[PDB]
Design a protein around this ligand. Structure first.
Ligand SMILES: Nc1nc2c(ncn2[C@@H]2O[C@H](COP(=O)(O)OP(=O)(O)O)[C@@H](O)[C@H]2O)c(=O)[nH]1
Ligand SMILES: [Mg+2]
Length: 448
């Protein structure tokens, strides 16, 4: 019937997003069936019902979708694919904000990322239990526990919340509590949360269900064509190169013929194995993985197959069924990469760019297009000496354009030394915006 929605959690360090995730993950004693998958964890709808029971006191409950899928992996893997395709990787985003700290640098970074991404999101106001002399009711709804609290506590909460709402107003986005908010489009919804007590978690889950079911009912339907995107390319012993992928829709089976985007060219291979993590320590001891002859959306799965090393993160994966043309499909999957590649001119004066994923590369090229800096070549995966040579060619005619913009990429020591001696400039940042700031700083420092 319906397709399970995908949730992603992003916040400044020590906000409690991991702890919150663990609280939601917590085994329910009554339900159950929550499985840790590769790059994600899945919650069956019954477990959510069990967790969202108290929300019956304030809101109408709907449980149409089979489950909720959230992404465990730290960072921004949920945005490794193109923004148009982005809906597949992340239906809704959870921005965790410490009610104590309020807005922080990584928070503003994440906000800007979401605005560029045009991705819908809600904010979780975590650490509310830390409010002075807060009396906690484990796993209670927010409004109930708030009503339970003393006037002093309510006033402290109101002060901090008002401050944070003001800070969000500074970033240009209007914010309101989820029940108070009239329109989701204009106002972002705040749900106060405590990852330790579990307070607000029912509100959060209910809100996710509401937004995803109502707004994304349109977005999430069942499709017989496969829908999947590669979160990561990782090397696992006994399998060589494997790809960790989120299967948003459809069925994947062993022995399937699949085509995926690759740096040099399109990759075609047959699935040798479909793998999921194994919870039981005793069984995990024999083998770290469980094999599935067939796998059904929505879940995060590790795919083992030939020629996976060339694979690019963020790329969509297509299965050629009978009556389908594999070559046509290769062009189809490659279309995003080619689409980005064309924007760069192999012939002309430009800078060199290297990125980890398609989405990061997209954001980079968008930034350069805005700043009007031309790009001669595009790079994916680890930086090598040749990639630096590409920039080295620019040195004779234009010293200023002989630079490398690299995001979330690993640079070889040989490449590092070569660039060091040659005088090429390499920009590398964990955060995409850090690279923007440092780069503009470099341009203005060369401008003087
Ligand atoms: N009191 C309280 N502490 C929290 C809450 N959420 C997180 N913490 C604390 O914050 C510390 C670090 O949080 P962590 O989950 O590692 O943040 P993350 O790495 O950004 O996900 C942990 O030791 C938690 O005890 C909360 O809701 N209430
Ligand atoms: Mg963490």
């Amino acid at each position: 019937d319906l397709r399970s929605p995908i949730c992603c959690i992003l916040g400044h360090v020590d906000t409690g997003k991991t702890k919150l995730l663990d609280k939601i993950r917590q085994t329910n004693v009554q339900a159950g069936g929550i499985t840790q998958q590769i790059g994600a964890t899945y919650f069956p709808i019954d477990a959510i019902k069990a967790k969202t029971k108290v929300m019956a006191e304030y809101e109408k409950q709907t449980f149409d979708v089979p489950g909720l899928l959230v992404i465990d992996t730290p960072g921004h893997e949920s945005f490794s694919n193109l923004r148009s395709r982005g809906s597949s990787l992340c239906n809704i985003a959870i921005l965790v904000i410490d009610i104590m700290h309020g807005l922080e640098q990584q928070t503003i970074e994440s906000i800007k990322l979401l605005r560029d991404r045009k991705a819908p999101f809600v904010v979780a106001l975590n650490k509310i239990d830390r409010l002075y002399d807060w009396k906690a009711i484990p796993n209670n709804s927010f409004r109930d526990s708030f009503a339970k609290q003393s006037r002093a506590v309510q006033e402290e909460f109101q002060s901090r919340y008002s401050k944070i709402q003001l800070e969000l107003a500074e970033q240009g986005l209007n914010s309101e509590l989820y029940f108070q908010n009239k329109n989701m489009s204009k106002y972002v919804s705040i749900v106060p949360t405590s990852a330790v007590t579990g307070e607000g978690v029912p509100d959060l889950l209910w809100l996710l269900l509401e937004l995803t079911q109502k707004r994304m009912s349109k977005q999430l339907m069942y499709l017989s064509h496969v829908e999947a995107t590669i979160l990561e390319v990782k090397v696992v012993e006994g399998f060589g190169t494997t790809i960790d992928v989120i299967l948003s829709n459809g069925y994947l089976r062993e022995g399937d013929r699949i085509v995926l985007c690759g740096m040099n060219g399109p990759i075609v291979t047959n699935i040798r194995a479909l793998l999921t993590p194994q919870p039981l320590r005793e069984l995990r001891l024999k083998s770290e993985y469980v094999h599935h002859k067939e796998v059904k959306a929505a879940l995060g799965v590790k795919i083992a197959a030939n020629d996976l090393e060339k694979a690019v993160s963020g790329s969509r994966l297509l299965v050629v069924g009978p009556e389908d043309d594999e070559d046509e499909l290769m062009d189809d999957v490659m279309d995003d990469l080619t689409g980005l590649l064309d924007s760069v001119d192999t012939t002309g004066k430009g800078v060199v760019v290297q990125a980890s994923t398609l989405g990061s590369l997209e954001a980079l090229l968008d930034f350069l297009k805005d700043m009007k800096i031309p790009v001669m070549s595009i790079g994916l995966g680890p930086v090598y000496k040749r990639d630096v040579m590409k920039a080295s060619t620019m040195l004779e005619k234009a010293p200023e354009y002989a630079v490398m913009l690299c995001f979330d990429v690993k640079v070889d020591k040989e490449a590092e030394q070569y660039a060091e001696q040659e005088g090429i400039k390499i920009f590398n940042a964990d955060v995409i915006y850090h690279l923007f700031d440092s780069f503009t700083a470099y341009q203005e420092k060369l401008l003087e």
